[PDB]
A paper describes a structure:
Strigolactones (SLs) are a class of important plant hormones mainly regulating plant architecture such as branching, which is crucial for crop yield. Different from other receptors, which could only sense hormone molecules, the receptor D14 have dual roles to sense and hydrolyze SL, demonstrating a brand-new function mode. During the hydrolysis of SL, D14 covalently binds to the D-ring at the catalytic center, then it associates with downstream protein MAX2/D3 to form D14–MAX2/D3 SCF E3 complex. This ubiquitin ligase complex will recruit the downstream transcription repressors SMXL6/7/8/D53, leading to the degradation of SMXLs/D53 through the 26S proteasome pathway.
Here, two putative SL receptors SsD14a/b and the interacting F-box protein SsMAX2 were identified in Saccharum spontaneum. The crystal structure of SsD14aΔN was determined at a resolution of 1.65 Å. SsD14a belongs to the α/β hydrolase superfamily, of which the structure consists of an α/β hydrolase core domain and a four-helix lid domain (αT1, αT2, αT3, and αT4). The catalytic triad residues of S145, D266, and H295, distributed on the loops following the β4, β6, and β7 strands, are located at the bottom of the hydrophobic substrate-binding pocket. The rest of the core domain is made up of seven β strands (β1–β7) and six α helices (α1, α2, α3, α8, α9, and α10). R310 is located at the α10 helix of SsD14a. Structure comparisons revealed that the overall structure of SsD14a was identical to those from other plants in the open state, with root-mean-square deviations (RMSD) ranging from 0.250 to 0.301 Å. Notably, the overall structure of SsD14a in the open state was apparently larger than the closed state of AtD14-CLIM (covalently linked intermediate molecule, a hydrolysis intermediate of SL molecule), thus these two structures cannot be well aligned, with an RMSD of 0.662 Å. Furthermore, results of docking approaches demonstrated extensive binding of GR24 by residues in the catalytic pocket of SsD14a. Mutagenesis analyses revealed that residue R310 at α10 helix of SsD14a was crucial for the binding with SsSMXL7/AtSMXL7 but not SsMAX2.
Author numbering: 0 to 268
Write the structure that this text describes.
């Protein structure tokens, strides 16, 4: 597996901004680090911002996608820590969307002194239901996503993109579809399978970093009740912030409102 040093190029690592307060921005499924481009200038005057692409992003050469290594989220965590260690960053705030919120939770447990604060957007510890637990999906319907992605990825993408964006923002729909279509279909399916096989409920109590959970009014993959569950079970001091906007991708569809929350969350850590 590639070293942290090699990952700096493979994952298109970028470091921008001023100061010694470090913020890492980690994008979610179906995008790449360009998803942060609209909120980024709200952070770079006050923070040193580290950006990178998950190995599944369309902007990463498909040759580096190890279908063995990456069938667990633990390997995505390995990559994040390797990048931060290569950059010689001992302490940071971490902002993760979607799968990266799960990666952030796992990274905080692996390296408690490295993560001074987590900000989780579109966050869920488990997407499948379980008795007294509402995740949003039953097993036969995650299986329906899989069959649709495999049978007709392009048609699945055009249907999913407006649902994910949620609000009526056509430039966000087109920009998300573009990065969804840049992904190779088999890699896209593989990451989705990995995310739906992840269940972090049993380790939330092991997180000790303070956390801010960012909740929008409506999220196709995250039920409103999930944020309360995270606040109840995360092992650190946790606050829920409410974006009065609709959708799963507020960094695409409502950058100004999102930036207000991020600046508040990242003021002291």
């Amino acid at each position: 597996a590639p070293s942290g040093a090699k990952l700096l190029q493979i994952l298109n690592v970028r470091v921008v901004g001023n100061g010694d307060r470090v913020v890492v921005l980690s994008h979610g499924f179906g995008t790449d680090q360009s998803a942060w481009s609209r909120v980024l200038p709200y952070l770079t005057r006050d923070h040193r911002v580290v950006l990178y692409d998950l190995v599944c992003a369309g902007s990463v050469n498909p040759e580096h996608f190890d279908f063995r290594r990456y069938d667990t989220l633990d390997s995505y965590v390995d990559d994040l820590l390797a990048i931060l260690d290569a950059l010689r960053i001992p302490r940071c705030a971490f902002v993760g969307h979607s799968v990266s919120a799960m990666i952030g939770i796992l990274a905080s447990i692996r390296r408690p002194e490295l993560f001074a604060k987590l900000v989780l957007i579109g966050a869920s510890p488990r997407f499948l239901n379980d008795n007294d637990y509402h995740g949003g999906f039953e097993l036969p319907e995650i299986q329906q996503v899989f069959d649709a992605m495999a049978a007709n990825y392009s048609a699945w993408a055009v249907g999913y993109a407006p649902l994910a964006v949620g609000a009526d923002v056509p430039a966000a729909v087109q920009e998300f579809s573009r990065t969804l279509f840049n992904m190779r279909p088999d890699i896209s399916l593989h990451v989705c399978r990995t995310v739906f096989n992840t269940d972090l409920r049993g380790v939330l109590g092991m997180v000790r970093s303070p956390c801010v959970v960012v909740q929008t009014t409506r999220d196709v993959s995250v039920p409103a009740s999930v944020a309360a569950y995270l606040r109840a079970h995360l092992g650190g001091r946790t606050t829920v912030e409410f974006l009065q906007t609709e959708g799963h991708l507020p960094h695409l569809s409502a950058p100004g409102l999102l930036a207000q929350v991020l600046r508040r969350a990242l003021a002291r850590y």
